Design an enzyme around this catalytic site. Structure first.
Site, PDB file in Angstrom:
ATOM      1  N   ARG A  80       0.848  -1.195   0.000  1.00  0.00           N
ATOM      2  CA  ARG A  80       0.000   0.000   0.000  1.00  0.00           C
ATOM      3  C   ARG A  80       0.883   1.244   0.000  1.00  0.00           C
ATOM      4  NH1 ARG A  80      -3.440  -0.616   4.580  1.00  0.00           N
ATOM      5  NH2 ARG A  80      -4.642  -2.023   3.223  1.00  0.00           N
ATOM      6  N   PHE A 127       1.133  10.495   1.848  1.00  0.00           N
ATOM      7  CA  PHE A 127       0.872   9.928   3.165  1.00  0.00           C
ATOM      8  C   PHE A 127       1.935   8.941   3.624  1.00  0.00           C
ATOM      9  CE2 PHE A 127      -3.295  11.430   1.701  1.00  0.00           C
ATOM     10  CZ  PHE A 127      -3.662  12.216   2.778  1.00  0.00           C
ATOM     11  N   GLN A 141       3.448   1.480   3.002  1.00  0.00           N
ATOM     12  CA  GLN A 141       3.199   0.442   3.998  1.00  0.00           C
ATOM     13  C   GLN A 141       3.601  -0.925   3.455  1.00  0.00           C
ATOM     14  OE1 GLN A 141      -0.774   0.433   5.541  1.00  0.00           O
ATOM     15  NE2 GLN A 141      -0.602  -1.635   6.408  1.00  0.00           N
ATOM     16  N   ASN A 157      -1.263  -1.423  12.317  1.00  0.00           N
ATOM     17  CA  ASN A 157      -1.986  -2.278  13.251  1.00  0.00           C
ATOM     18  C   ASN A 157      -3.455  -2.337  12.859  1.00  0.00           C
ATOM     19  OD1 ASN A 157      -3.564  -0.217  14.661  1.00  0.00           O
ATOM     20  ND2 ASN A 157      -1.643   0.409  15.637  1.00  0.00           N
ATOM     21  N   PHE A 175       4.853   1.210   8.443  1.00  0.00           N
ATOM     22  CA  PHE A 175       4.735   2.193   7.379  1.00  0.00           C
ATOM     23  C   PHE A 175       5.795   3.263   7.558  1.00  0.00           C
ATOM     24  CE2 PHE A 175       2.379   5.648   9.646  1.00  0.00           C
ATOM     25  CZ  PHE A 175       1.987   4.939  10.780  1.00  0.00           C
ATOM     26  N   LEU A 185      -2.442   9.846  13.568  1.00  0.00           N
ATOM     27  CA  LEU A 185      -2.025   8.519  13.990  1.00  0.00           C
ATOM     28  C   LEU A 185      -1.311   8.541  15.332  1.00  0.00           C
ATOM     29  CD1 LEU A 185      -0.824   7.293  10.527  1.00  0.00           C
ATOM     30  CD2 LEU A 185      -3.074   6.972  11.611  1.00  0.00           C
ATOM     31  N   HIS A 219      -0.559   4.511  16.720  1.00  0.00           N
ATOM     32  CA  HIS A 219       0.483   3.709  16.094  1.00  0.00           C
ATOM     33  C   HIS A 219       1.802   4.019  16.785  1.00  0.00           C
ATOM     34  CE1 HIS A 219      -1.938   2.322  12.622  1.00  0.00           C
ATOM     35  NE2 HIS A 219      -2.651   3.371  12.988  1.00  0.00           N
TER      36      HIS A 219
END
Ligand SMILES: Nc1nc2c(ncn2[C@@H]2O[C@H](COP(=O)(O)OP(=O)(O)NP(=O)(O)O)[C@@H](O)[C@H]2O)c(=O)[nH]1
Ligand SMILES: [Mg+2]
EC number: 5.2.1.8
Lengths: 166, 170
Positions: A56, A61, A64, A103, A114, A123, A127
């Protein structure tokens, strides 16, 4: 660093080398989470990141990856078991290069992680941040260009080799 | 005639939102789980003799990103609210989706269909009567579906179009 391990990923695009990204793992502040990533990067437990995909990649952003068990973005496992608890939230998602655990809610860290390409402050506290890109941020920016709005990548981006430096 | 409808598929993670949509669009059942970020599809259909273009927004099952999800709801004309019949938490989440839709649309009358998916599985935890009672209390249809066998798939989407058309008549 005199305390924090450095690990590397050699990134490949459909098998072709793109470049090396190295990471400082903040064992000084997040030791259990840093140690998991270090050990998965060396493969010393018999499993780990080598060969796995960045499944991903969303420009603006993050990138991942880290599913080496199901190979489809749903899997992963830590050196402590399938999941381990959120160790601490001392560090925040302050900008590009931050390395943080993916997660599925509280206390579900495994192996997926990521790399931020921007500040992702929403986040914070959800995270666990445990490292940062040391060298090769240009390589991460190059990976980001293979992504898309929904994260699907236009070529297969993999960790062709990985290990511990210094 | 031809019309066009913006449909939005919402519900908790893993309930079958994407599998239902992919059955409708591509006529196959995806057995592997590919988590959604966002996907959009278009399909021309005929419902009750009236041709229409369905614009389907397949959303991720997540409660983060309220402002992005509010935009989906503003633009959507009808909502498929999906739970899985073997996931009680996903059923308990339905009322939150309905509350968010009503708040964003500023209305208590929003075209919606309650979908109980995965009816092929032997591990049910949510009774049909429970879901029927919830749908009755909302004044909306309830459809049981299986994306795996295709049972109820067309019915769910077509029923939602009927709800939009009934709403436009008021
Ligand atoms: N047996 C069965 N499995 C189903 C059914 N619908 C979906 N599944 C399975 O359930 C899993 C999740 O389905 P998916 O459609 O991806 O769920 P989602 O609601 O889109 N998840 P997300 O919110 O993460 O995007 C997949 O393994 C899929 O094959 C169904 O009707 N029956
Ligand atoms: Mg989905």
């Amino acid at each position: 660093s005199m305390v924090n391990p450095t690990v590397f990923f050699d990134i490949a695009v459909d098998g072709e080398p793109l470049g090396r990204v190295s990471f400082e793992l903040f064992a000084d502040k997040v030791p259990k989470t840093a140690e998991n990533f270090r050990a998965l990067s060396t493969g010393e437990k018999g499993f780990g990141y080598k060969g796995s995909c960045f499944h991903r990649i969303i420009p603006g952003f993050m990138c991942q990856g880290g599913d080496f068990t199901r190979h489809n973005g749903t899997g992963g496992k830590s050196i402590y078991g399938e999941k381990f608890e959120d160790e601490n939230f001392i560090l925040k998602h302050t900008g590009p290069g931050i390395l943080s655990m993916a997660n599925a809610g509280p206390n579900t860290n495994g192996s997926q992680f990521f790399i931020c390409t921007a500040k992702t402050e929403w986040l914070d506290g959800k995270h666990v941040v445990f490292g940062k890109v040391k060298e090769g941020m240009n390589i991460v920016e190059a990976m980001e260009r293979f992504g898309s709005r929904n994260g699907k990548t236009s070529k297969k981006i993999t960790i062709a080799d990985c290990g511990q430096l210094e | 005639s031809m019309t066009e409808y913006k449909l939005v598929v919402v519900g908790a993670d893993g309930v079958g939102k994407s599998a239902l949509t992919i059955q409708l669009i591509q006529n196959h059942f995806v057995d592997e789980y590919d988590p959604t970020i966002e996907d959009s599809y278009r399909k021309q259909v005929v419902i009750d003799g009236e041709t229409c273009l369905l614009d389907i927004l397949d959303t991720a099952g997540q409660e983060e990103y309220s402002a992005m999800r509010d935009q989906y709801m503003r633009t959507g004309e009808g909502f498929l609210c999906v739970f899985a019949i073997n996931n009680t938490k996903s059923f308990e989440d339905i009322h939150h989706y309905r509350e968010q839709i009503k708040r964003v649309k500023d209305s208590e009358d929003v075209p919606m269909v309650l979908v109980g998916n995965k009816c092929d599985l032997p591990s049910r935890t949510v009774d049909t009567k429970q879901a029927q009672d919830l749908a009755r209390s909302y004044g909306i249809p309830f459809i049981e579906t299986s994306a795996k066998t295709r049972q109820g798939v067309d019915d769910a989407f077509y029923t939602l179009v009927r709800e939009i058309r009934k709403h436009k008549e008021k």
